[PDB]
């Protein structure tokens, strides 16, 4: 009965934390993508022109 | 490490380590105008890039400043790579300087106070590395003295003029013995023992624990003619011990090892039973002469670095004591690394089922000789090489080419041909035969040679490529030097070697293959690339330059280049064993091939059929089995693992941990020192429900039975197809059978594999009325496509074929109660009615499972098994020595995640990370790492490598599906939930024109589902996985605003191609790292600004995208990312004909 | 988990046994990697095709360097003469140190000792030991606080007692003989002697002569005098 | 306590590695006093 809540708590603490941090990290991946992308597409299209 | 004190009294401690390119920036900052008087108009890049060695010394604080570069020829043009030996002997006839024993310096700098110490330490390091380097030559224009620094080490010697001018150069010399002695050898005395005794006890207790403390002394006393003991001495004291014995139990060696090359271990004898009259593998050469090899049988040595050269010198004295003996043997027990002494030895090859407790090594009296020399082909060589090659397979070809080049000055076509012989004591034993490459661009497009060259400093003129190279193996230890001299003499930087798939043509070893003798040891394997699919019809001129575009007879690339030609590349003798490959296992073998730091020697693969991908199939055979698209025939050819991987055929049949042994059935034994289990999941027999349609029960009753195993006899007309070999077996049997013409056949199992089989059989040509197809209801109601529109399309195609489709059913008994083999008629239960069907043949894809046989073999092991095999989240089984991965594996319940498993992820990412973990046990160059914290034991860490399934489908559609790892969930449930995703979808599945993506509300892409009658560029589309809609050219607007006509055509446009390009992902890593950099005193990073704005740490009236984009475009970071991109375009433009930077104009 | 280290030695070459493994050719039928096949007999040439070059001397000529110790170590001293006496039998019981080890150890301990620090730790400056002329200039009154009423005057040779010596002078000379010579080398020695050598023999009782210890060769001895002949080494 | 049969399995599990350098073994036995007295018996 003790170990049950020990495991449940440890699991849910881990899983929630993982979700939260990955969620935050995503936005940064978005903004880095945006900045890479707009140049990459512009200058490649430009060359072929 | 060594301690140095500045004249200021400041103290530093320093290490020497072999240069890494980041060092170059620092070292170049050291360079001085004074140094430019010594070596001016050096730009380091060129000299390093041609270097024979780069050596750096550095302090505990990672302040880097001590460096020198050395090469096999002088600076200042005082002589040539062509030759220098006579001119230097004309300086001093007594100096034995030759490429055997000579190197020149070409640069140094250090911060002066530490510098003077560092120069000494670097010199000591070099002489410690390269034992024949008895001297370093240092040369300056005569107007310069060396001055204090170098005067502390180098002494002056007769001058050389400029080869051209009335400009003289002065010559100065440093002596190895001054900065690293030889040994002295004398035959042991009792007093000598006491010095050595602590050394042995430092190494090991065990011998003393048997013998008692004075064993070494008693051994010293023991000596006679049959056993001599000898030591090296320094400081008037011993610190090395070597034992030899005359006895060698020849019957053992004659059984265990193929002495074909090594007849000499016996005397000649006129019967010479050296040949037979697979039995050749059973045959053993019956030597009838006498034992003229001797063994070494005890060795320890250490100041420790003194061992490195001095061990070799022992061999010279040892041979002196055996006038009758010419070979030295040593047997080496497993796990023991090759310390220096053994490395000179040839590693003997054990026979085709030898198993010994040891590996065996050879060295020969001639090795002591030093007249080994290279010269380029002339006439007399013909006789010597004829004597030499007489056993060589292509002995005729090699001879004929040597004779040709002696006439022609050319190869038959006319291109460069170069042929080299090794001359020894006025005798020959070496041959090399090498050709000059020109498809270097093809190489560079196919393989990452760039890992080991900065190609742009090299030139298309500079490349050699090997074809034939054969030797007295004894010389092979020197041979690494032989490659150095070859490269010098040919004026080439690189040697290349192509390994050609050993299946070859269906019979022919096509002449693109080469007859490779020993060289493969010294080369490196080069990681294989991935070309983008090019829409050449949309490009015309703007193609990847057509040579690169070509296909060619696909093969593996191996290489050496001068800077490598010193690296000992320390072998690993550990018997590391990997079990199975299905779905996954190959990935582990790849990483262990593809790390040049190491050289695996005992690694062995055990598999039902050994290697993957043997067969020259034709694609219809591939149609049978749904694929993960992560490997193909050409991939297997490139990976070429057989080149180093040792292979056994048939699966394994028992574990036995206590021996650390594994059984292949019929008591054929393999031994492991690490055991990695990776069978994948495999199909198991579709067990009949037993309870029948003829018995009309309620379906849940039958459902419980349906879980059970089958244990009856196997129908000769029932098929289980795990593998291409199974598919070929079945297909040949079908072609040799009537059924294809006429029969009625069941494929059973609702998995994609069924639909792929159905399409395959329709391709073979069975009438769709022939085909019957039954798909039982699931334990969880996710279809094997989770796309009802495409599923409906397939089902309508099945209708047009007339395939016989049955939901809900469960397998009542084929042949009911009558004898089951062959099947002829079958029953199926349902929620309402009986079914009967006519079944000429039955195909299973019912459930994948661990194999019963191997499951039992595991349970015998008493490795923890919970219906699937139990591991921690760092692959440890209940045995510290046994580890497991892939969908056959599962975590402890404590992880509370029995839904989440290795089954969920990519295969490759699993194998890659598993190998990375296991390397940490093997690799000395990274530090050895602790066992996991329990804190890791808390969790399964989120991998991301997308999982691929892809298929051809009834009515000749192509299909491809890619996923983020997840617990299944129905499409419509996720779509009706708002809290998930925006989707992007251009499609009509029945019309054969279909994409679906899902994007996540984090606006990344994390799904693919595509359905097709077009050969999709899956390699390109796989890169679409995980991409932001921005990266896909603000794709979301393109989907919204009626802008995209369809996805397939739109990806043709050139900008996407970089997104496909592999380096671009690492460039994205660079670009993130640039944003991680902090550019100005006042400013957070762009990342920290975003973090604040997104976390409500700042709050806004505009939405965060607007604020962030404005602040970025206002900021200077944009220029830095733009510049970085342009630079990458420069490098990649070689690969890519469509990226603008200064360089286009 | 797993290690890499051993005593790094061979074994299975032993003539005594083909026994313990029984069948060693008992594995599965191998399918080798390529690389060893490239090493194997058909890719390689055989040793008997290779030339046996002529001479051991050619190897010796190819040698290049002066070894570590051979020369600076040279001295006139006879080696066996270094050896202490000790009573350990020739044929010790196994597990005992064999005799020769004891000799090395004892001699090394003795070399490692310095008489100067021992004698000073007992409290005696060796220079004090020699008899002196009385300084009639300043005859030491008992107030002066010297240990004796007056320094050494009776020759120490009177009290020097043979109780402790392990060898007779004749034995010392014999031990000087390295066997097989007609005539012995001198034996190595340390001895207490002045630093101004001519004045030393001219006036061994001089007030100002400083008596220092030094290493020496030992030339002969006379029972007639009971004196040894010794010289400071080169 | 109750663990006999395990002994047999371990007993077979016991390794088989030989006397690492047989000359030493022979020489040791030749110094054995009992062997020397056997030579005297001869």
Swiss-Prot record, chain A:
It is found in: Cytoplasm; Mitochondrion; Cytoplasm, Cytoskeleton, Cilium axoneme. Part of a complex containing MYCBP, AKAP1 and PRKAR2B. Interacts with MYCBP and AKAP1. Interacts with CFAP61. Belongs to the CFAP91 family. Involved in sperm flagellum axonemal organization and function. May regulate cilium motility through its role in the assembly of the axonemal radial spokes. The chain holds residues 540 to 588 of 783 of the full protein. This is Cilia- and flagella-associated protein 91. Phosphorylated by PKA. The gene is Cfap91. It comes from the Eukaryota. It comes from Mus musculus. Expressed in the testis, in cells involved in spermatogenesis.
From Swiss-Prot, chain B:
Disruption phenotype: CFAP61-null male mice are infertile. The epididymis contains fewer spermatozoa in the cauda and caput regions compared to wild-type animals, and spermatozoa exhibit short, bent, curled, thick or missing flagella, and are immobile. Acrosome morphology is normal. The length and motility of respiratory tract cilia is also normal. It is found in: Cytoplasm, Cytoskeleton, Flagellum axoneme. Pfam families: CFAP61_dimer, CFAP61_N. One of its GO terms (biological process) is cilium movement. This is Cilia- and flagella-associated protein 61. Keywords: Cell projection, Cilium, Cytoplasm, Cytoskeleton, Flagellum. Component of axonemal radial spokes, the protein complexes that link the outer microtubule doublets with the central pair of microtubules. Interacts with CFAP91/MAATS1, ODAD2/ARMC4, RSPH3A, ROPN1, ROPN1L and RSPH9. Interacts with DYNLT1, DYNC1I2 and TUBB3. Interacts with WDR35, IFT22 and IFT81. Its main location: cytoplasm. Expressed in testis, brain and lung; the expression in testis is higher than that in other organs. Detected in spermatozoa in seminiferous tubules (at protein level). Not detected in the respiratory tract cilia. PANTHER family: CILIA- AND FLAGELLA-ASSOCIATED PROTEIN 61 (PTHR21178:SF8). It comes from Mus musculus. Involved in sperm flagellum assembly. Plays an essential role in the formation of the radial spokes in flagellum axoneme. GO terms for cellular component: axoneme; motile cilium; radial spoke; radial spoke stalk; sperm flagellum. It comes from the Eukaryota.
Curated annotation (Swiss-Prot), chain C:
It comes from the Eukaryota. Transmembrane segments: none annotated. Disruption phenotype: Mice are viable and show no malformations; however, homozygous males are infertile, due to inability of spermatozoa to move from the uterus into the oviduct. Spermatozoa show decreased motility. In addition, tracheal beating frequency is reduced. Signal peptide: none annotated. It is found in: Cytoplasm, Cytoskeleton, Cilium axoneme; Cell projection, Cilium, Flagellum. Consists of at least two heavy chains and a number of intermediate and light chains. Force generating protein of cilia required for sperm flagellum motility. Produces force towards the minus ends of microtubules. Dynein has ATPase activity; the force-producing power stroke is thought to occur on release of ADP. Required in spermatozoa for the formation of the inner dynein arms and biogenesis of the axoneme. Belongs to the dynein heavy chain family. This is Dynein axonemal heavy chain 1. The gene is Dnah1. The chain holds residues 75 to 308 of 4250 of the full protein.
